[PDB]
């Protein structure tokens, strides 16, 4: 079934080395690290928040959410399950392992990946938009209505494609460090989601 | 494809371990050693991607050699690596791109002994580096520890269907799992040091 993904792709109040201005004055494909043959849904809603511009898209594709199902599967850390009383659910589970950031380059897509290069980019994944939406405590009612309002099979790769993704993430230098201060920065937390870093 | 050997110390005994589990001695080897075993990917059992061919006792510890056959599991791994930016990157010149002992070095880079020799991104014991290579002369260079009596020894020993019974997705599934794995470069690196490999020689990635 389909896997809401939502969360910051860009952060206002972070610097370092998409200013409100240029976003709020500029659907997406939803594609795999970038890959242009692995798009896996859409972007539904995407609002210029106070501190970011925040984006709910969903995993749609079959395909890809059958690979998934079939690698979760495999996996002690999906195995090990989550933060009771938090349902056990192995594709989302799986997806917030592996991709557990978002990378937008609104523009051209929207890219799930690792850990995403801007702060603040951490992704939660969910079964109900409604839900996704109240991990993020910067999200006000207002928030929460405007992307409300806005709320065959795309994917041309496959398992190995993924697979040789994976190893290219093994060796993203600080990623879980990276990880944790994302998760700190937005608000989400490892006990009331499904992030597993 | 074609096969691949790995080689490295499935234990070092001049490291100490917190963890009694992970002690072994080298009386306990020694012996076992005076009164093969199949290679498989993280101790999985039906992930077996070829057997123990050399396993000798020396000064710094148990050094062993494999080899990798499954022409199934070396299949899975060669489409994966053309869909890696690791290994697109390529190897330290002069050394020759090879996609799958690249792709393996990246994934495998520790061992684990456990009845079996298991390959797995990290090992617990240090000093548990992979070394892989297309020929196991290149691969027992690799490592300054050794001698060539040790190296004579090993030579002996390896001079003299497909097993695997898992897929890409079990090998995807896996992978999450390494991810999470707790200071595992950290681990390589030091495992890279305190063996004596070095990128510039060998297809290592950490």
Request: net charge neutral; with cysteine; proline share 7%.
């Amino acid at each position: 079934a389909p896997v809401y993904v939502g969360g910051f792709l860009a952060r206002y109040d972070q610097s370092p080395d998409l200013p409100r201005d240029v976003v709020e004055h500029w659907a997406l494909p939803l594609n795999i690290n970038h890959d242009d043959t692995a798009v896996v849904g859409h972007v539904a809603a995407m609002q210029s928040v106070r501190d970011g511009l925040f984006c709910l898209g969903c995993v749609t594709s079959p395909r890809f959410l059958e690979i998934v199902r079939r690698a979760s599967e495999k996996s002690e850390l999906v195995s090990r399950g989550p933060v009771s009383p938090l349902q056990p659910d192995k594709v989302v589970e799986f997806l917030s392992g592996s991709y557990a950031g978002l990378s937008l380059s609104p523009f051209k897509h929207v890219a799930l990946c690792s850990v995403g290069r801007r702060r603040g980019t951490l992704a939660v994944y969910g079964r109900d938009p409604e839900w996704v939406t109240q991990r993020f405590p910067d999200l006000t009612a207002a928030d929460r209505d405007g992307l409300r309002a806005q709320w065959g099979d795309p994917f041309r790769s496959d398992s190995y494609g993924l697979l040789g993704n994976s190893v290219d993430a093994l060796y993203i230098r600080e990623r879980l460090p990276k990880l944790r201060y994302d998760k700190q920065l937005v608000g989400v937390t490892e006990r009331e989601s499904y992030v597993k870093a």
